[PDB]
Enzyme design. Structure first.
Site, PDB file in Angstrom:
ATOM      1  N   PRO A 100      -4.959 -18.687 -35.263  1.00 40.52           N
ATOM      2  CA  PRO A 100      -4.769 -18.896 -33.814  1.00 40.52           C
ATOM      3  C   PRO A 100      -3.706 -17.941 -33.294  1.00 40.52           C
ATOM      4  O   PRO A 100      -2.598 -17.871 -33.844  1.00 40.52           O
ATOM      5  CB  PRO A 100      -4.280 -20.347 -33.716  1.00 40.52           C
ATOM      6  CG  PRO A 100      -3.755 -20.707 -35.122  1.00 40.52           C
ATOM      7  CD  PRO A 100      -4.549 -19.859 -36.075  1.00 40.52           C
ATOM      8  N   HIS A 131      -2.204 -28.976 -33.102  1.00 40.02           N
ATOM      9  CA  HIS A 131      -1.085 -28.074 -33.385  1.00 40.02           C
ATOM     10  C   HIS A 131       0.155 -28.896 -33.694  1.00 40.02           C
ATOM     11  O   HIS A 131       0.905 -29.278 -32.788  1.00 40.02           O
ATOM     12  CB  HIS A 131      -0.841 -27.119 -32.230  1.00 40.02           C
ATOM     13  CG  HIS A 131      -0.052 -25.928 -32.603  1.00 40.02           C
ATOM     14  ND1 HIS A 131       0.736 -25.889 -33.733  1.00 40.02           N
ATOM     15  CD2 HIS A 131       0.055 -24.727 -32.006  1.00 40.02           C
ATOM     16  CE1 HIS A 131       1.297 -24.699 -33.803  1.00 40.02           C
ATOM     17  NE2 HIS A 131       0.903 -23.974 -32.776  1.00 40.02           N
ATOM     18  N   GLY A 132       0.424 -29.105 -34.981  1.00 39.74           N
ATOM     19  CA  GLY A 132       1.609 -29.793 -35.448  1.00 39.74           C
ATOM     20  C   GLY A 132       2.684 -28.888 -35.984  1.00 39.74           C
ATOM     21  O   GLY A 132       3.550 -29.366 -36.720  1.00 39.74           O
ATOM     22  N   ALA A 133       2.653 -27.618 -35.601  1.00 41.51           N
ATOM     23  CA  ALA A 133       3.458 -26.577 -36.207  1.00 41.51           C
ATOM     24  C   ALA A 133       4.226 -25.761 -35.161  1.00 41.51           C
ATOM     25  O   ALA A 133       4.166 -26.010 -33.940  1.00 41.51           O
ATOM     26  CB  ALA A 133       2.546 -25.672 -37.058  1.00 41.51           C
ATOM     27  N   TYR A 192       6.294 -26.601 -31.537  1.00 37.33           N
ATOM     28  CA  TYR A 192       5.748 -27.209 -30.337  1.00 37.33           C
ATOM     29  C   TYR A 192       5.855 -28.731 -30.393  1.00 37.33           C
ATOM     30  O   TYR A 192       6.553 -29.258 -31.260  1.00 37.33           O
ATOM     31  CB  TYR A 192       4.364 -26.645 -30.042  1.00 37.33           C
ATOM     32  CG  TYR A 192       4.431 -25.164 -29.794  1.00 37.33           C
ATOM     33  CD1 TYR A 192       4.814 -24.664 -28.568  1.00 37.33           C
ATOM     34  CD2 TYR A 192       4.045 -24.245 -30.774  1.00 37.33           C
ATOM     35  CE1 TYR A 192       4.879 -23.291 -28.338  1.00 37.33           C
ATOM     36  CE2 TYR A 192       4.072 -22.904 -30.545  1.00 37.33           C
ATOM     37  CZ  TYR A 192       4.449 -22.413 -29.330  1.00 37.33           C
ATOM     38  OH  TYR A 192       4.394 -21.036 -29.181  1.00 37.33           O
ATOM     39  N   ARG A 227      -2.501 -28.209 -37.988  1.00 36.58           N
ATOM     40  CA  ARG A 227      -1.638 -27.122 -38.440  1.00 36.58           C
ATOM     41  C   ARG A 227      -0.220 -27.656 -38.608  1.00 36.58           C
ATOM     42  O   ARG A 227       0.288 -28.416 -37.759  1.00 36.58           O
ATOM     43  CB  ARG A 227      -1.628 -25.963 -37.447  1.00 36.58           C
ATOM     44  CG  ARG A 227      -1.187 -24.662 -38.089  1.00 36.58           C
ATOM     45  CD  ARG A 227      -1.260 -23.435 -37.208  1.00 36.58           C
ATOM     46  NE  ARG A 227      -1.437 -22.261 -38.065  1.00 36.58           N
ATOM     47  CZ  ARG A 227      -1.121 -21.017 -37.736  1.00 36.58           C
ATOM     48  NH1 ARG A 227      -0.364 -20.759 -36.701  1.00 36.58           N
ATOM     49  NH2 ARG A 227      -1.551 -20.032 -38.491  1.00 36.58           N
TER      50      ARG A 227
HETATM   51  C1  LIG Z   1       0.272 -12.801 -30.574  1.00 38.46           C
HETATM   52  C2  LIG Z   1       0.385 -14.002 -31.473  1.00 38.46           C
HETATM   53  C3  LIG Z   1       0.181 -15.251 -30.964  1.00 38.46           C
HETATM   54  C4  LIG Z   1       0.296 -16.372 -31.764  1.00 38.46           C
HETATM   55  C5  LIG Z   1       0.607 -16.261 -33.098  1.00 38.46           C
HETATM   56  C6  LIG Z   1       0.796 -14.995 -33.646  1.00 38.46           C
HETATM   57  C7  LIG Z   1       0.703 -13.869 -32.867  1.00 38.46           C
HETATM   58  C8  LIG Z   1       0.933 -12.509 -33.464  1.00 38.46           C
HETATM   59  N1  LIG Z   1       0.663 -17.449 -33.870  1.00 38.46           N
HETATM   60  C9  LIG Z   1       0.948 -17.338 -35.314  1.00 38.46           C
HETATM   61  C10 LIG Z   1      -0.282 -16.849 -36.067  1.00 38.46           C
HETATM   62  O1  LIG Z   1      -1.297 -17.840 -36.096  1.00 38.46           O
HETATM   63  C11 LIG Z   1       0.074 -16.540 -37.518  1.00 38.46           C
HETATM   64  O2  LIG Z   1       0.464 -17.759 -38.113  1.00 38.46           O
HETATM   65  C12 LIG Z   1       1.232 -15.553 -37.652  1.00 38.46           C
HETATM   66  O3  LIG Z   1       0.938 -14.379 -36.893  1.00 38.46           O
HETATM   67  C13 LIG Z   1       1.526 -15.208 -39.095  1.00 38.46           C
HETATM   68  O4  LIG Z   1       0.302 -14.893 -39.810  1.00 38.46           O
HETATM   69  P1  LIG Z   1      -0.145 -13.353 -39.922  1.00 38.46           P
HETATM   70  O5  LIG Z   1       0.949 -12.622 -40.625  1.00 38.46           O
HETATM   71  O6  LIG Z   1      -0.247 -12.875 -38.512  1.00 38.46           O
HETATM   72  O7  LIG Z   1      -1.440 -13.348 -40.691  1.00 38.46           O
HETATM   73  C14 LIG Z   1       0.196 -18.655 -33.341  1.00 38.46           C
HETATM   74  N2  LIG Z   1       0.004 -19.759 -34.115  1.00 38.46           N
HETATM   75  C15 LIG Z   1      -0.551 -20.904 -33.610  1.00 38.46           C
HETATM   76  O8  LIG Z   1      -0.657 -21.889 -34.291  1.00 38.46           O
HETATM   77  N3  LIG Z   1      -0.930 -20.920 -32.307  1.00 38.46           N
HETATM   78  C16 LIG Z   1      -0.785 -19.848 -31.457  1.00 38.46           C
HETATM   79  O9  LIG Z   1      -1.185 -19.956 -30.302  1.00 38.46           O
HETATM   80  C17 LIG Z   1      -0.216 -18.686 -32.008  1.00 38.46           C
HETATM   81  N4  LIG Z   1       0.062 -17.625 -31.257  1.00 38.46           N
END
Ligand SMILES: Cc1cc2c(cc1C)N(C[C@H](O)[C@H](O)[C@H](O)COP(=O)(O)O)c1[nH]c(=O)[nH]c(=O)c1N2
Ligand SMILES: [Cl-]
Length: 368
Positions: free
Chosen positions: A22, A175-177, A180, A228
């Protein structure tokens, strides 16, 4: 090879074990509807071969849930209907599509209904607002959420989940992570309540457990519901779950046993020990519950993903940055093709789809 093994997730049959993580792109309409730019954006990951696409966090209610300006919602029937054509496009390419459902809590930066924010306790988050979602400087101190506001929030998760199912999504991810609302309730640092939403590390699960129950009543027993989880918060990437391995196993078990169909965990480094010594956070989850575990955090290459799966640290691999660097990540791994390095300038100054497309045009860097 394990990355490209099919799997099952409840009734869903996934072509492989690669998922798009996400990612908030603040590219929806100002009042929450999804749009055609988002259609093409999400469909591209499906065309690139991902077995599962998890949406950005979608807000749940027309009260405090919205966390960023131009974030999409699932609160109204108009929101629901705006997602239909996106769901259809992702499905036409063969990917399952899961709606992540999120309440901003204390980490809200923009909400069209209220300046006031709500959180389990009136405690200002540390860190600083993420400028590429809109906003700058310290987080606001939230108001302590009331019982009536808690019930409104729970009902909003349930309604948004029913809307996701009606729009054709294959599942929802609660979204439990990442700091938030739900995570704030889980956490020892930020949930200082003395009522039946507070307490010890298990007592603090009561709000997430209530959300799971309400969502399951709204979607029925055959629909996929995941959650999550993380130690880290956007406002504090160093935060740890209270305790260590054994308390983590107990949280994973309680939440799974409430009737989740998968857990999705995320850490700064998915391969590192959760508590300094011993197993990774994903490995702890996978070793304590029978449902599938999606892991995430810094997984860039095919070799890294394969190692995590073949070692038994997770059942599926969610990638964010790597999916943005190559929307056809799983196909390129199978063909032995080089990956592009993720380049964060693609998000400057706002992480929108429009800015990404301009960046790709200037750099010759096609998503596929
Ligand atoms: C632009 C952007 C936006 C978000 C995120 C990241 C980024 C780069 N991440 C975190 C994302 O899901 C992921 O956990 C992290 O980016 C780390 O994993 P990667 O290293 O990117 O594979 C994130 N996670 C989530 O649970 N909901 C969200 O809306 C978002 N938003
Ligand atoms: Cl905790």
């Amino acid at each position: 090879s394990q990355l490209l093994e099919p799997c099952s997730l409840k009734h869903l049959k996934l072509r492989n074990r690669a998922a798009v993580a996400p990612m908030t792109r603040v590219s929806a309409e100002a009042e929450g509807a999804a749009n055609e730019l988002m259609r093409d954006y999400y469909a591209s990951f499906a065309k690139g071969g991902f077995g599962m696409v998890i949406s950005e966090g979608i807000y749940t209610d027309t009260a405090y849930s919205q966390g960023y300006f131009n974030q999409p919602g699932l609160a109204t029937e108009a929101h629901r209907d705006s997602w239909r054509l996106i769901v259809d496009a992702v499905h036409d390419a063969g990917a399952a599509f899961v709606a992540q459902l999120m309440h901003g809590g204390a980490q809200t930066q923009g909400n069209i209904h209220h300046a006031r924010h709500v959180a389990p306790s009136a405690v200002q988050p540390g860190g600083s607002q993420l400028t590429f979602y809109g906003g700058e400087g310290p987080y606001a101190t939230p108001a302590q959420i009331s019982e009536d506001e808690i019930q409104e929030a729970i009902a909003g998760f349930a309604q948004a989940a029913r809307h996701a199912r009606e729009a054709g999504f294959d599942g929802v991810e609660l979204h439990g992570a990442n700091g938030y609302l739900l995570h704030e309730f889980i956490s020892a640092e930020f949930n200082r309540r003395d009522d039946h939403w507070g307490g010890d590390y298990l007592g603090r699960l009561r709000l997430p457990l209530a959300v799971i129950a309400a969502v399951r009543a709204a979607v029925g027993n055959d629909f996929v519901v995941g959650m999550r989880l993380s130690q880290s918060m956007v406002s504090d990437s160093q935060l740890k779950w209270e305790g260590g391995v054994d308390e983590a196993r107990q949280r994973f078990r309680a939440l799974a046993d409430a009737g989740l169909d998968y857990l999705h965990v995320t850490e700064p480094d998915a391969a590192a020990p959760a508590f300094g010594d011993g197993p990774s956070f994903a490995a702890i989850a996978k070793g304590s519950v029978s449902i599938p575990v999606i892991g995430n955090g810094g997984i860039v290459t095919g070799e890294q993903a394969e190692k995590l799966l073949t070692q038994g640290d997770m059942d599926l691999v969610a990638v964010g940055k790597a999916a943005l660097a190559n929307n056809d990540w799983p196909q390129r791994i199978a063909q032995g093709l080089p990956l592009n390095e993720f380049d964060g300038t693609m998000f400057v100054p706002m992480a929108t789809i429009t800015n990404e497309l301009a960046w790709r045009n200037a750099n010759g860097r096609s998503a596929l």
